[model samples]
Target: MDVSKRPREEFHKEQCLSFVKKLWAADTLAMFHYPVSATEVPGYYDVVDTPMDLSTIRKNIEQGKYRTDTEVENDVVLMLSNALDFNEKGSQWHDLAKQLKKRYLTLAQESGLSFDAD
Candidate 1:
């Protein structure tokens, strides 16, 4: 199958990194910044096959792994969705993830960037 129906947008690393900082500022709990460790929660990996974290996304960006803005957007979605998938609906973590997702959309628009789905 084709990778994408349309082409992905390119961006400067400066904008990407700046956007990440805005996300960090929004994350008051710092929950999205770090990875969820197995010792912290038993069977965490069992439920989340692909663990995504903001710190990991930052590292990936620093390492030049993300060639397109779409890649970064996808990883942010993955990080938020992973939390929603692992935590229960009533969980505070779940609610926090939802909040972050909402703020993420706002930040994207304010930064003059847009996700593929938008």
Candidate 2:
């Protein structure tokens, strides 16, 4: 997918936040753009039986349980920064963000209308 000049409408914080809520709840009816399958990324957020919080994010990071986090934080910085900057894809962060987003988002999107990412 063309990550460059992607429509700004596709990455809304409100949508992400809503999707996060449903995701954390482990709702049988939820979806994501990436491959967040409990099996693919063992000990991902879905593994937590308790409420998700900073500690959970930390746990996932510390154990390297989520392959997504093992990537350089710079890549995540790029993604969040891109999401915040909204329109501009800055520096080398553009390709990094797009690939990561595509890796995850496509998984969620392919799941279909049975559930919504947001």
Candidate 3:
């Protein structure tokens, strides 16, 4: 008897993971590849509602958490948006956040992710 198996795995499995991996490897966005420390920055939790990072996004993707292109897009946005939330305008972190977000907008297409056909 042969074992039953689900072929094709999860949606955008390779594409999603590749996108995160490449994005995290970028030296320009190195600061956001890891999570922010609450102990290091007091009042961070009080100011920021939710925390996100490149590490978390990749973990979830490997765990099959994001089922669609839109879901993956949302998670990426969350990671970038967290910084824009915690960092005040005109600050270095704030500028980096904006830059990272703008980076995603371009990389997604380069990674062959399309969420427009919904």
Candidate 4:
């Protein structure tokens, strides 16, 4: 459906398809990594109905939905990629991954599986 004749459809589609290609090529790092200023994943924040949720992510993981392990690894790597100083006021910000990983691990343990992010 042309649906409102969205004038920028071509440009948006090109951009989306290009990144989808990158995503298919195992680029999970970009998927999970969030900018400090934003709480949402970058692209999914568009006006479209896309969303980033843990269940969706988990489903994608178990189904091997990512193009390659590189994608998964990149996603994992990006969590701890940001380095923060221990004594700095912003330490909590950088340690978000650690906190999230810990929570995820705790949930996994509760779920009867030993989840280790190492």
| lDDT against the true structure, each candidate | 0.82, 0.36, 0.75, 0.37
Q: Each prediction's TM-score against the native? A: 0.84, 0.23, 0.80, 0.29
- Rank order by TM-score, top first? 1, 3, 4, 2
**How accurate locally is residue 105 in candidate 3, as Cα lDDT from 0 to 100?**
63
* lDDT value, residue 66 of candidate 4: 61
Off by over 4 Å in 1: 1-9
All predictions: root-mean-square deviation over Cα? 3.3, 16.5, 5.5, 16.2
Ranking by lDDT: 1, 3, 4, 2
Please write out the lDDT profile of model 3 over residues 79-117, one tens digit for every residue. Answer: 778788888899887897888787886777778776543
Tens digits of lDDT, candidate 4, 1-118: 6657633222222222333343333323333333222344233234223334333344556565664433433443333343222213355544554554445433333333322233
Off by over 4 Å in 3: 1-10, 27-29
Candidate 3, residue 30: the lDDT equals 77
Choose 2 or 3, whichever is better by lDDT: 3
Best by lDDT: 1
- Model 2 has an lDDT value of 0.36
Which is the better candidate, 1 or 4, if ranked by TM-score? 1
Q: What's the C-alpha lDDT at position 33 in model 3?
A: 78
Please list all clashing residue pairs in model 2, or write none if there are none. Answer: 32-108, 33-104, 33-105, 33-106, 33-107, 33-108, 34-104, 34-108
Whose lDDT is higher: candidate 1's or candidate 2's? 1
